[PDB]
Amino acid sequence: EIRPTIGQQMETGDQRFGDLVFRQLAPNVWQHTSYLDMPGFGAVASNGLIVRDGGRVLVVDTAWTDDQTAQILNWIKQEINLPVALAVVTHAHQDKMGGMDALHAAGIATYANALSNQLAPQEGMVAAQHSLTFAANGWVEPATAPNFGPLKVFYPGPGHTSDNITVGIDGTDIAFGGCLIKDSKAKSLGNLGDADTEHYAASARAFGAAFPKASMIVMSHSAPDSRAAITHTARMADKLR
Ligand SMILES: CC1(C)S[C@H]([C@H](NC(=O)[C@H](N)c2ccccc2)C(=O)O)N[C@H]1C(=O)O
Ligand SMILES: [O-]
Numbered sequence: 543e544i545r546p547t548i549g550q551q552m553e554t555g556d557q558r559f560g561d562l563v564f565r566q567l568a569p570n571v572w573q574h575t576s577y578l579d580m581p582g583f584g585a586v587a588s589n590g591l592i593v594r595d596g597g598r599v600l601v602v603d604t605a606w607t608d609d610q611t612a613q614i615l616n617w618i619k620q621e622i623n624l625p626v627a628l629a630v631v632t633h634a635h636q637d638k639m640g641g642m643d644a645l646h647a648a649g650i651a652t653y654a655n656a657l658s659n660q661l662a663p664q665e666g667m668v669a670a671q672h673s674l675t676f677a678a679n680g681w682v683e684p685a686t687a688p689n690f691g692p693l694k695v696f697y698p699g700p701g702h703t704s705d706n707i708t709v710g711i712d713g714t715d716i717a718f719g720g721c722l723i724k725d726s727k728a729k730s731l732g733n734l735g736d737a738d739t740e741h742y743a744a745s746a747r748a749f750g751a752a753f754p755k756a757s758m759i760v761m762s763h764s765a766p767d768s769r770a771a772i773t774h775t776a777r778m779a780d781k782l783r
């Protein structure tokens with residue numbers, strides 16, 4: 543059993559598949575979890591999403607590595623057995639974009655914030671194939687996100703990074719904050735090295751206001767939580783200013 547140093551532990555309802563863990567969150571939504579092993583420190587878990595939208599699958603975030611991301615595709619083939627149409631990746635860091643080459647090799651169309659694509663090489667990441675742009679209110683420009691089905695992509699402003707984006711799943715209780723949101727019991731906002739400490743709190747609140755209905759808040763390094771994760775993240779961020 544994988545017991546992360548950072549990230550949620552395995553609980554009942556989790557399925558181990560190769561080096562990864564999968565958890566069903568709703569009839570057509572699963573959380574993928576992958577682990578980066580740091581010698582002398584242990585494993586760091588990272589979470590993304592898998593969405594079945596009719597007859598295709600949509601992915602939110604890669605795993606840490608190409609091989610782990612290929613394992614996600616293999617899990618999809620074995621458990622869902624539908625074509626993977628596209629992926630949205632939520633900023634240019636390894637936990638979110640480390641497996642882009644695996645998606646590209648499989649013929650999967652990839653999308654990221656234009657800024658993520660611009661930062662990608664500087665951050666050691668392969669850029670997505672397509673760039674999302676955003677209105678001043680944070681909502682994705684519709685023509686840059688064609689055929690996204692239930693995915694509602696929102697740029698909340700600079701926080702964890704300047705490029706961080708978020709994704710709601712229409713028809714479900716779920717909104718995904720990626721690395722921007724930490725859980726309601728976290729005492730740290732994680733790595734603030736690339737963070738905007740002035741604007742973080744407003745960005746966390748903007749995420750909450752963009753997806754006001756969502757009751758299940760999914761994030762990169764904790765199990766899904768209530769909206770208290772948003773409130774708590776914003777309150778920790780208030781202390782940075
Ligand atoms: C879990 C993290 C503390 S690390 C991760 C990310 N860092 C990486 O992907 C690094 N490439 C990395 C280096 C060494 C060990 C683990 C991750 C970041 O800086 O936002 N997201 C951070 C976060 O979400 O707070
Ligand atoms: O990250």
Ligand SMILES: [Zn+2]
Pocket residue numbers: 633634635702703721
């Ligand atoms: Zn990051």
Ligand SMILES: [Zn+2]
Pocket residue numbers: 588637721762763
């Ligand atoms: Zn992270």
